[PDB]
Each structure stands twice: as structure tokens, then as C-alpha cells.
Design a protein around this ligand. Structure first.
Ligand SMILES: N#C[C@H](Nc1ccc2c(c1)CNC2)c1cncc2ccccc12
Lengths: 39, 156
């Protein structure tokens, strides 16, 4: 049986850690909501 | 119980101890999370109960108490912030420039940050602090790392 606990406000943080890349992927979404890579 | 706006962890006591299975967004009295986090089950908030209102396995989204309220969209240009709430760890904003998930029905933003499965439901934000989507539904690339879509619902 699931429950919820609060974890903070939803705000933009100036001077936050900037990481990660921006890839361009070809994907397909099936009936079960599961993405997959297409080549 | 507590219905104040903000980010919330989704926990369960069915496994060993207290395990975090996901995250959600409380806005305008509606809890918004990813379908694979709750599987459509009713949640608990103190003594109060949260019943599912709308849901869809394909979109992978689910709202509680009312219709889906989040309606902001990534402009396809600006950097965004993942308000990642990981299991056992404090909520933390990570700025990133999303990529593109190209599909047969259209393009969708994608954040390339890797976090545990329990981080699913964490909101992705624009410079105004508006919720542009939720993290936790994507793919596993050639590098092993996870690339999540920016999943947004429809506000009726
Ligand atoms: N938990 C979970 C995720 N799996 C999943 C994601 C989407 C769907 C389902 C399962 C069922 N259908 C929709 C998942 C899997 N692997 C690594 C992840 C890293 C970050 C966040 C979610 C991840």
C-alpha cells in the first residue's frame, strides 16, 4: 500500500549543476508505453 | 491529508523496510505521477486517501483527485531543470539541454540524466518553474545510460 511524503517546492534554481548531453534518437512507442531504439 | 503544492516521494512498506518506488507533483489539488510508479493503485497521505481519476498506460501518466492540470511545454530551445528526487537523497535541481526523441507521430524532448528507477515521476521545469513534463519513461542507449522523454499530459 503506497503513501506520499513531501520533498520540497517546485522552483528554478539559478546556479544549479549543469550536466548531461542532448542526443537525437530514433524511437518507437508500443501499446504498453515502452520506448525502444530504432536503427 | 496534506495537499500543499510541491514535489512528493512515492513510498511503499510492502517490501523490506521503506522503499521509494517513484515521485509525483501536487498542483491545484491533483497528484500527478507516472503510471508505472503506482500501477493505478490508490495512494495514502497521512490519514487521507488519494483515489485515481484519470490514467493511461501508453502515455504512462496518472492523475489523482482530479483531471491532469500540468500543461506547459518545452520550447524546443531553452535549457530545462530536472528536479530529481532520488531514493534516500534530498531533492536537487539539475540543469540540462534536452535532446529529441523522434517518432512516427512527432518529436518529443528528452533528458539524458541517469538516476535510480525510484526517481520516476520527478518533474522537469522551464525557467518560470512551470512543470513541462515528468521523468522516468525512455530508453537504454549504446552507452548503457538512460535517456528519458519529457512526458506531458493534456489539460482538458
Ligand atoms: N521504474 C522504471 C523505469 N522503467 C519503466 C519505464 C517506463 C515504463 C515502464 C517501466 C512500464 N511501462 C512504462 C526505468 C527503467 N530503467 C531505468 C530507469 C532510470 C530512471 C527512471 C526509470 C527507469
Amino acid at each position: 500500500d503506497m503513501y506520499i511524503e513531501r520533498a520540497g517546492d517546485i522552483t528554478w534554481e539559478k546556479d544549479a549543476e549543469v550536466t548531461g548531453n542532448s542526443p537525437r534518437l530514433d524511437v518507437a512507442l508500443d501499446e504498453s508505453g515502452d520506448f525502444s531504439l530504432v536503427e | 491529508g496534506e495537499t500543499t503544492d510541491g514535489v512528493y516521494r512515492v513510498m511503499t512498506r510492502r517490501l523490506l523496510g521503506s522503499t521509494q518506488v517513484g515521485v509525483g507533483v501536487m498542483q491545484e489539488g491533483v497528484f500527478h505521477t507516472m503510471w508505472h510508479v503506482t500501477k493505478g493503485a490508490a495512494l495514502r497521505s497521512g490519514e487521507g486517501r488519494l483515489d485515481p481519476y484519470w490514467g493511461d498506460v501508453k502515455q504512462d501518466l496518472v492523475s489523482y483527485c482530479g483531471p491532469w492540470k500540468l500543461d506547459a511545454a518545452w520550447d524546443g530551445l531553452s535549457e530545462v531543470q530536472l528536479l530529481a528526487v532520488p531514493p534516500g537523497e534530498r531533492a536537487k535541481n539539475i540543469q540540462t539541454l534536452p535532446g529529441i526523441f523522434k517518432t512516427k507521430d512527432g518529436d518529443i524532448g528528452a533528458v539524458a540524466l541517469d538516476y535510480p528507477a525510484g526517481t520516476s515521476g520527478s518533474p522537469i521545469l522551464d525557467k518560470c518553474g512551470r512543470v513541462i513534463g515528468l521523468y522516468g519513461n525512455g530508453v537504454v542507449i549504446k552507452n548503457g545510460s538512460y535517456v528519458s522523454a519529457i512526458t506531458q499530459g493534456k489539460r482538458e
